[PDB]
């Protein structure tokens with residue numbers, strides 16, 4: 001029933017954000033006492049958010065979440081606007097970061113105490129990606145089994161760190177660090193606090209673009225939000241107990257210094273230390289890049305059938321179906337983030353436009369309650385509970401103008417370049433007839449190049 | 458739809474497009490191995506990591522000589538139980554140890570009626586002493602006992618026969634280490650007959666019970682050859698002296714003191730302190746106290762301080778007081794003898810709030826001392842500079858390098874920093890960041906420029922610059 005329903009809700013989350021972010025929230029909050037409050041504010045803020053997409057997902061329910069709900073409210077250039085953002089800002093940078101953490105957990109155990117050269121942690125993040133689409137361009141029945149082993153190694157490394165952290169208090173020096181030094185301090189409340197939350201919410205990502213599928217398989221009709229309060233603080237509990245395993249065994253200086261917080265915890269406890277902590281976490285990050293390529297197929301089928309996304313995208317190979325021109329376009333836009341500089345410059349660049357698009361769908365959810373009632377909502381949320389989300393959410397956007405507009409500036413350049421190609425894409429008067437031959441010339445060229453046939457029609 | 462279809466496509470795509478799709482795919486996997494083996498080259502050409510040199514606890518921070526307990530707390534609470542309440546202050550200073558004592562029983566000047574096992578009941582009991590260790594070790598502040606036998610008279614080592622004096626010390630090492638102390642300190646071993654022999658035994662007793670236990674020895678000497686004779690067979694012995702007690706006040710002379718002390722020992726672990734018991738103010742004017750401090754915190758070794766050397770405790774600025782043991786000035790009610798003799802910028806409580814005060818300089822260095830992996834165990838290279846300058850660089854492998862420039866002269870000078878001998882890893886940039894300055898009146902963070910660098914009379918600088926090439 002729901003006992004098998006909770007476990008797949010936990011499976012979407014707890015990817016690889018937990019193996020990066022404790023050096024990021026500890027960097028921007030000073031104290032390890034205040035940095036644990038950030039992991040408690042994120043768990044609550046995801047309860048509020050995922051409970052609305054429990055509601056908003058079940059009203060409309062066409063296919064292709066966060067974009068059809070954008071379509072059914074806006075249905076114009078704002079729907080293509082969110083497809084333009086997510087294809088070029090959110091989904092590539094959500095995959096380059098997880099590909100980068102895979103590289104640093106191979107090279108940091110080899111050194112073990114030096115900064116890994118940046119020009120060699122990028123060319124392993126490309127081999128983590130360019131090999132992994134070539135699996136997914138081959139058969140999915142291999143590719144779903146490979147991912148099935150990568151939720152075991154993820155959950156085994158987490159449960160190891162808890163018992164390795166719990167015994168450290170019990171053995172000797174109970175509350176060995178016990179620091180709450182900047183509990184009154186290092187809290188600018190409009191600067192360093194919010195950038196602790198952009199990172200602390202990266203480790204909870206995934207509650208939105210995958211939580212639709214849980215409902216229709218168990219046919220609970222309305223029993224799903226009963227699971228979403230049981231499931232998600234249990235996940236928040238797990239993110240708490242690793243931070244206690246980091247804070248008691250390590251110090252507040254080692255966590256600021258290292259690219260890899262997990263291997264310093266791995267060095268303290270034992271001497272094997274090369275078969276355990278980088279292996280069982282190097283398999284965690286290698287599944288989330290793999291788990292982010294199944295979902296890239298499902299999105300282009302939605303966008304192409306409405307008229308956006310030129311039809312070379314979303315076409316399947318005959319033998320061993322695997323949307324080749326879909327998957328090429330994901331990995332090409334992921335590799336162009338190898339021209340970046342540092343991870344937490346990209347997490348602050350990811351999470352700006354992420355929490356913008358999530359706030360737009362819920363405003364669209366709430367303007368669909370002012371206008372157009374009686375659409376037979378099957379879930380009743382409180383009148384201010386999504387409003388309680390939104391004014392909390394729009395706080396994070398506007399305060400990221402006073403703090404670092406170097407990333408938000410150029411990100412508005414790329415979304416105001418999607419408009420230009422909107423008016424050439426779907427507004428366009430089809431008169432000149434060279435390009436309507438030229439599009440058909442290019443489309444048959446790429447189909448002859450990649451051997452792809454259209455969707456069954 | 459701009460679709461070219463599925464059944465009609467199979468006729469068009471077959472002819473020679475089988476070969477150029479079989480061969481286009483081969484350039485992928487030959488382009489993948491050119492990125493696989495193109496990333497194995499960079500990891501092999503990448504140099505090494507320098508391993509960490511097995512630091513003990515007395516390598517990672519200062520020490521704090523507490524001589525007279527009755528004058529550290531004051532009148533009324535001059536005891537061991539009153540010491541248990543001050544540890545929340547000492548942890549703010551981030552000292553890693555306390556030289557405590559001597560607290561044993563000395564009647565006066567008697568070999569017969571001086572015992573090293575029994576403490577003086579002016580202080581307390583062993584149950585006060587066992588509580589003191591267990592309370593301090595909760596905070597990771599280690600306790601070192603002072604075992605100088607005759608700590609009340611002229612000769613500290615009892616000018617009569619000497620082996621029974623040594624036999625007491627031979628046995629008290631065995632006893633107190635059972636109680637749980639983490640090291641010992643004897644002083645004034647210029648009044649010890651065959652002094653360099655008994656330490657190597659007492660080193661071996663201290664190493665004969667553990668290896669996180671140290672021994673500190675004091676002397677009044679300032680001669681180099683007298684010191685190195687005591688360090689001949691001994692190597693893991695900390696030796697405080699008066700090697701820097703001579704005034705000099707010229708940078709090229711202090712450079713001649715320190716570099717010769719390092720070159721004679723080679724590279725071993727020193728212990729930088731001006732004196733074995735006395736304060737910094739006893740040898741210095743009050744405008745040089747902010748200047749020896751930084752040097753003490755940057756030179757390779759364990760700095761050892763006496764109490765009140767962080768607040769500039771001078772005994773001569775407060776009459777009606779014992780020079781050997783001054784009165785700690787916590788606040789305005791710390792000197793009950795004369796009312797109104799203490800100003801507001803002369804106390805612990807008054808200097809605990811000013812960001813410019815001398816105690817505020819101490820917590821900024823003792824923070825950066827036991828956290829920067831350069832300053833803990835970095836190699837050391839001083840280099841030539843102007844006439845009144847002492848300049849040097851501390852650097853570990855790829856961590857944040859440092860640069861200290863000191864002005865022992867009363868003329869506003871320029872830098873004139875030319876390296877010309879520093880290695881490839883320690884080559885200097887032109888622009889370099891600032892961390893702090895001794896005299897206030899700088900932009901603490903503005904990246905300074907070394908060729909356009911001037912100094913004020915008696916002002917020192919702690920720059921830092923990251924690893925680059």
Ligand SMILES: CCCCCCCCCCCCCCCCCC(=O)OC[C@H](COP(=O)(O)O)OC(=O)CCCCCCCCCCCCCCCCC
Pocket residue numbers: 307308309310311312313325328329332421424425426439446458459460
């Ligand atoms: C990078 C991945 C390559 C492998 C996959 C091939 C994909 C090819 C297309 C890539 C871009 C796909 C998104 C295009 C934006 C959406 C447009 C849309 O929705 O139209 C629907 C529209 C309808 O298609 P239908 O449904 O098939 O009729 O399709 C088109 O209009 C195709 C238009 C192609 C050109 C787009 C505009 C480009 C303007 C700037 C051109 C600059 C060229 C470079 C200049 C020289 C530089 C050196």
Ligand SMILES: CCCCCCCCCCCCCCCCCC(=O)OC[C@H](COP(=O)(O)O)OC(=O)CCCCCCCCCCCCCCCCC
Pocket residue numbers: 130133134137138324328331332335446449450451478479481482485
């Ligand atoms: C920094 C860049 C270096 C690394 C990336 C290099 C770029 C290579 C392409 C991007 C990533 C490729 C991933 C590998 C995919 C192959 C997986 C596989 O084995 O499938 C078998 C798949 C099916 O086998 P078949 O039975 O032989 O058809 O083989 C292919 O279809 C060929 C795949 C190779 C395509 C590489 C070049 C693509 C040409 C794009 C031309 C676009 C022009 C028009 C649009 C332009 C708009 C601006």
Ligand SMILES: *[C@@H]1O[C@H](CO)[C@@H](O[C@@H]2O[C@H](CO)[C@@H](O)[C@H](O)[C@H]2NC(C)=O)[C@H](O)[C@H]1NC(C)=O
Pocket residue numbers: 657658661664665690
């Ligand atoms: C202790 O120091 C002595 C020399 O100063 C080292 O050799 C010992 O010498 C004494 C002579 O008084 C002998 O009784 C010991 O048996 C010697 N120790 C041996 C042979 O191990 C000695 O190496 C030092 N102790 C340690 C632990 O290094």
Ligand SMILES: *[C@@H]1O[C@H](CO)[C@@H](O[C@@H]2O[C@H](CO)[C@@H](O)[C@H](O)[C@H]2NC(C)=O)[C@H](O)[C@H]1NC(C)=O
Pocket residue numbers: 647677678679
């Ligand atoms: C250490 O302090 C003493 C105390 O003044 C210095 O003087 C010695 O004093 C003792 C007796 O008090 C005499 O027997 C010595 O002859 C004195 N030394 C000299 C050189 O005359 C002693 O010099 C100081 N030690 C050093 C190395 O300077």
Ligand SMILES: *[C@@H]1O[C@H](CO)[C@@H](O[C@@H]2O[C@H](CO)[C@@H](O)[C@H](O)[C@H]2NC(C)=O)[C@H](O)[C@H]1NC(C)=O
Pocket residue numbers: 720721
């Ligand atoms: C001080 O360090 C220098 C190396 O920088 C060495 O001094 C050499 O000593 C020998 C013998 O006295 C001379 O022939 C050389 O010319 C000296 N070289 C220099 C550069 O001064 C030596 O390692 C140290 N000095 C001593 C006395 O050990």
Ligand SMILES: *[C@@H]1O[C@H](CO)[C@@H](O[C@@H]2O[C@H](CO)[C@@H](O)[C@H](O)[C@H]2NC(C)=O)[C@H](O)[C@H]1NC(C)=O
Pocket residue numbers: 800802803
């Ligand atoms: C506390 O600070 C004040 C202000 O800096 C000091 O007052 C000056 O001290 C210097 C040297 O002691 C004198 O030359 C000046 O004449 C003093 N100025 C005034 C207006 O009195 C004061 O001395 C400091 N306290 C102590 C104990 O040094």
Ligand SMILES: N[C@@]1(C(=O)O)C[C@@H]2CC[C@H]1C2
Pocket residue numbers: 012013014015016017018094098202203204205206288
């Ligand atoms: N939502 C993520 C997952 O693990 O699925 C994706 C990115 C990396 C970690 C979190 C953000």
